[PDB]
Design a protein around this motif. Structure first.
Motif, short mmCIF file in Angstrom:
data_model
loop_
_atom_site.label_atom_id
_atom_site.label_comp_id
_atom_site.label_asym_id
_atom_site.label_seq_id
_atom_site.Cartn_x
_atom_site.Cartn_y
_atom_site.Cartn_z
N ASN A 12 7.08 -5.96 -3.25
CA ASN A 12 7.21 -4.51 -2.69
C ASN A 12 8.39 -3.90 -3.49
O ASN A 12 8.68 -2.68 -3.20
CB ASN A 12 7.42 -4.32 -1.50
CG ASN A 12 6.26 -4.73 -0.71
OD1 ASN A 12 5.33 -4.73 -1.05
ND2 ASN A 12 6.53 -5.79 0.43
N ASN A 58 8.81 -2.74 -6.35
CA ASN A 58 8.55 -1.34 -7.17
C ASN A 58 7.91 -0.17 -5.92
O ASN A 58 7.53 0.82 -6.74
CB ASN A 58 7.70 -1.50 -8.27
CG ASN A 58 6.12 -1.71 -7.82
OD1 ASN A 58 5.87 -2.88 -7.09
ND2 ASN A 58 5.15 -1.18 -8.19
N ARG A 59 7.77 -0.34 -5.05
CA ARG A 59 7.15 0.45 -3.83
C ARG A 59 8.16 1.07 -2.99
O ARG A 59 7.81 1.78 -2.13
CB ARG A 59 6.21 -0.24 -3.06
CG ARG A 59 5.01 -0.77 -3.63
CD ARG A 59 4.12 -1.38 -2.59
NE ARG A 59 2.77 -1.97 -3.14
CZ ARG A 59 1.49 -1.57 -2.61
NH1 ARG A 59 1.31 -1.11 -1.44
NH2 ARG A 59 0.48 -2.11 -3.26
N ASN A 60 9.46 0.91 -3.76
CA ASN A 60 10.64 1.44 -2.90
C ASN A 60 11.64 2.40 -3.90
O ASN A 60 11.99 1.69 -4.76
CB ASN A 60 11.37 0.35 -2.14
CG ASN A 60 10.68 -0.10 -0.83
OD1 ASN A 60 10.23 0.66 -0.25
ND2 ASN A 60 10.59 -1.20 -0.78
N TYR A 78 2.14 -2.29 2.09
CA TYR A 78 3.42 -1.97 2.01
C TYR A 78 3.62 -0.29 1.46
O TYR A 78 3.23 -0.05 0.53
CB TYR A 78 4.44 -2.80 1.39
CG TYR A 78 5.85 -2.33 1.45
CD1 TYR A 78 6.64 -2.39 2.53
CD2 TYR A 78 6.49 -1.38 0.30
CE1 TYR A 78 7.86 -1.67 2.94
CE2 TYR A 78 7.80 -0.87 0.62
CZ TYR A 78 8.52 -1.02 1.85
OH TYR A 78 9.72 -0.47 2.27
N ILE A 79 4.23 0.24 2.37
CA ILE A 79 4.61 1.84 1.98
C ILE A 79 5.85 2.11 2.83
O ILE A 79 5.89 1.80 3.92
CB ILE A 79 3.28 2.70 2.52
CG1 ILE A 79 3.75 4.23 1.85
CG2 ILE A 79 3.15 2.78 3.86
CD1 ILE A 79 2.73 5.42 1.95
N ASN A 80 6.96 2.48 1.88
CA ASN A 80 8.06 3.03 2.73
C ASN A 80 8.11 4.12 3.54
O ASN A 80 8.33 5.33 3.23
CB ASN A 80 8.99 3.15 1.78
CG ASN A 80 10.58 3.38 2.45
OD1 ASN A 80 10.81 3.90 3.43
ND2 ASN A 80 11.40 2.75 1.63
N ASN A 136 4.19 5.40 -9.05
CA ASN A 136 3.27 4.32 -8.63
C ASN A 136 2.69 4.23 -7.22
O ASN A 136 1.92 3.23 -6.68
CB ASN A 136 3.63 3.08 -9.00
CG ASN A 136 4.81 2.62 -8.23
OD1 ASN A 136 5.82 2.88 -8.18
ND2 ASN A 136 4.46 1.35 -7.63
N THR A 137 3.30 5.22 -6.25
CA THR A 137 2.76 5.11 -5.20
C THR A 137 2.10 6.37 -4.38
O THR A 137 2.19 6.42 -3.11
CB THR A 137 4.04 4.71 -3.98
OG1 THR A 137 5.05 5.69 -4.10
CG2 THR A 137 4.57 3.35 -4.53
N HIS A 190 -0.72 5.25 -2.53
CA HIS A 190 -0.66 4.88 -1.41
C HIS A 190 -0.22 6.02 -0.06
O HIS A 190 -0.75 6.07 0.86
CB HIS A 190 0.59 3.88 -1.36
CG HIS A 190 0.37 2.71 -2.58
ND1 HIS A 190 1.18 2.43 -3.20
CD2 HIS A 190 -0.77 2.00 -2.64
CE1 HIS A 190 0.87 1.42 -3.97
NE2 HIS A 190 -0.46 1.40 -3.80
#
Length: 278
Positions: A36, A38-40, A62-64, A86-87, A90
């Motif tokens: 995760n 790069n999801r942050n 995962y999603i912040n 990139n999110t 999401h």
């Protein structure tokens, strides 16, 4: 009153220093997982595992984002970080699954010559966006560019079920680069505009509030909102403690309110707002 006592003694920074240390601390293991990384958007702003919003994605959920459930006030909010390149898929997945109605952006895409978040929404109705990864399509229907903010009526369509959903985008565009608004008047006004739409009402999923980290300015929105709501359902301003309400929200997400300066503002906004919604 309490505000006046603090102001004359300039104890604000200490009051905040105290809040900052009273605040709850909970695990964020999922957030810290390498998968995760790069999801942050930020290393120091993560969603506690107990309150993180899980995507209904078998792949990686995962999603912040954190769900701040305010029991007494009977109001829930979803605080999230500005979507990363990139999110955005999401982000729109979450909005769809949580059956959210409104989206509150309390930041500009570029602030201080830096890009604080992704352009996750269409700017021209002729060119709609399609989030391949999450199989969702987003379209600009209209917008009302005003002095201190902008309302955009977007349409999110689940490409899997061809089902459409009207989403409202409340964009506050006049929050200073440094400091906090000189006066609550415009912020409260933006808050009330958000309220009138019904996006904050129980007949919908939680509103997705965000800035860059999605804690400083977004935290102020929610605190002001909730404080005003309780103060309303009690019609007893006296029992509404901003400090306690903030700490209460902190059990769900970290660093809501980043500076003692914002805290003072929250007091101002709430106090000013009481001269109406109470």
């Amino acid at each position: 009153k309490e505000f006046e006592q603090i102001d004359k003694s300039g104890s604000w920074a200490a009051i905040y220093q105290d809040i900052r240390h009273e605040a709850s601390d909970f695990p964020c293991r999922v957030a810290k997982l390498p998968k995760n990384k790069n999801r942050n958007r930020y290393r120091d702003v993560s969603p506690f595992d107990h309150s993180r919003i899980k995507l209904h994605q078998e792949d990686n959920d995962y999603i912040n984002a954190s769900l701040i459930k305010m029991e007494e006030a009977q109001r829930s909010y979803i605080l999230t970080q500005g979507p990363l390149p990139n999110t955005c898929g999401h982000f729109w997945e979450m909005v769809w699954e949580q059956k959210s109605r409104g989206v509150v952006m309390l930041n500009r895409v570029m602030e201080k010559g830096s890009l604080k978040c992704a352009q996750y929404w269409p700017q021209k109705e002729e060119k709609e966006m399609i989030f391949e990864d999450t199989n969702l399509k987003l379209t600009l229907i209209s917008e009302d560019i005003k002095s201190y903010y902008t309302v955009r009526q977007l349409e999110l369509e689940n490409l899997t079920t061809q089902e459409t959903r009207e989403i409202l985008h409340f964009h506050y565009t006049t929050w200073p680069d440094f400091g906090v608004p000189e006066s609550p008047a415009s912020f409260l006004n933006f808050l009330f505009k958000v309220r009138e739409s019904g996006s904050l009402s129980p007949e919908h999923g939680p509103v997705v509030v965000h800035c860059s980290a999605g804690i400083g300015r977004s935290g102020t929105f929610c605190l002001a909102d909730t404080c005003l709501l309780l103060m309303d359902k009690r019609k007893d301003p006296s029992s509404v403690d901003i400090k306690k309400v903030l700490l209460e929200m902190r059990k769900f997400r970290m660093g809501l309110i980043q500076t003692a300066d914002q805290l003072r503002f929250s007091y101002l906004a709430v106090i000013e707002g009481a001269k109406f919604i109470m």
